[model samples]
Target: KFVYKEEHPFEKRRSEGEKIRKKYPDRVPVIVEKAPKARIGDLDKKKYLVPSDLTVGQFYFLIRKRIHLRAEDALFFFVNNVIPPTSATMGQLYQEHHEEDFFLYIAYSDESVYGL
Candidate 1:
């Protein structure tokens, strides 16, 4: 019952993101959550302070490991419900798709749900 958005209002999240960015200028504030009813397991931690230079592919691998997924297991990440290019850097994605709250929201799911 710990829904992030419900618990943290827009103003609070924005300020939190600002504080984090101020403290770690080279990192991006991110919130990763499991897609509703998705088959994949939940992440041990919902928040991440990732390096700005980290690629989407690299972050994907990190999430896979966090969820205890095998190399063959299929996992997908969505930003505003769209899958971003793996080649893009987290900084780039954050600039393009970060929410008004200034946090990069990401949702993860397994391929089975999408019939892939």
Candidate 2:
């Protein structure tokens, strides 16, 4: 299971990387990337993800921020559904549709949902 401890992620990462480089100047630099795409429902094919090559810590941050995953929800709400009777523009529609999903995804996403 992947774990997120809720400390200052960027600061912790930068501090660790700096320590490593300071200890070994000639060694490789730390590289991090976001990965792990989102699955928008069982039926929908809208996938948003980060590269799987990222580190455990990097993947943790992606789960914390919820960017790609929330964007996937927004895509589903806007592209898949046509809420014409509602009073909302495109931007409003996405905003209203994905707010909670966005924030919740930031804190966590259940791997069980995807059966990973």
Candidate 3:
């Protein structure tokens, strides 16, 4: 289940995303959450106003720091239930996988649970 959309309707989320984008055109509205039964800890904050140019690899490391995971630990991220290319920019991902709510939702899980 989508964490943000579980409580908020699509129309409300869409308008909220619109307002945010209008205020910060250079940033993308993103929501990251732990996948069901994921062994990793939850992120301190689910909402992020990420720079549009940031690469997925950069974001992955940022989240690693947030979760205080060791470099050896394996974490996987999924966009629209599919793993995205690490080299892809946030803007490119937003354009391709953003939900009807206009928010790019990401889910993270440990490699063991998500499969190798």
Candidate 4:
């Protein structure tokens, strides 16, 4: 029987934090959260990476699909705690509401119940 051992113990792995942050240096980060039944089933309500060509309305539907909402379910989105014009571009919205090096936050709600 042979015992395996290293004279100098291996030090713990170095470095911390995710490298994904480096890849998103120029990306407009968007955080999407929901109020209640807005998000359902594997919905990525965390952070969405906004594309330069994506519009606010298109992004609205994208979130709807990602959240697994059925065709009949209604969804509404707000950016920076305010409702943005439907025709606005996500890139433009990001520029308007980016919170000091943070993401352009978007909160969703069930429009049918909220009535606005």
Backbone clash pairs for candidate 4 read none
Ranking 1 against 3 by lDDT, winner: 3
Q: Write the per-residue lDDT of candidate 3 for residues 4-108, one digit (tens) a residue.
A: 778888889899999998998888899998888788877999989999999999999999999999877888888867888899999999989888777899989
Write model 4 residue lDDT over 1-116, tens digit each, in one string. 00111221223111111222346645566666664444444454465677755777898788877877888776777764578878888778877886543456676777634224
Better of 2 and 4 by TM-score: 4
lDDT of 1 by residue, 65-92 (tens): 8899987788888887788889999999
- Give me the runs in candidate 1 sitting further than 4 Å from their true place: 112-116
What are the models' TM-scores? 0.89, 0.22, 0.90, 0.64
In Å, residue 107's CA in model 3 sits off its true spot by 0.4
Residue-level error in angstroms, candidate 1, position 3: 2.0
Candidate 2 structure quality by residue, lDDT tens digits, 1-116 = 11221433646645654565456433333221211343432222112333323333444344335443443332212112222222333233233432212210121222322222
Error of 1 at 93 (Å): 0.4
Tell me the whole-model lDDT of each prediction, alpha carbons only.
0.85, 0.31, 0.87, 0.59
Candidates ranked, most accurate by TM-score first: 3, 1, 4, 2
Best-matching candidate per TM-score: 3
lDDT of 2 at 21: 44
Error of 2 at 70 (Å): 33
Clashing pairs in 2: 35-50, 35-51, 36-50, 37-48, 37-49, 38-48
- Where does candidate 1 clash, by residue pair? none
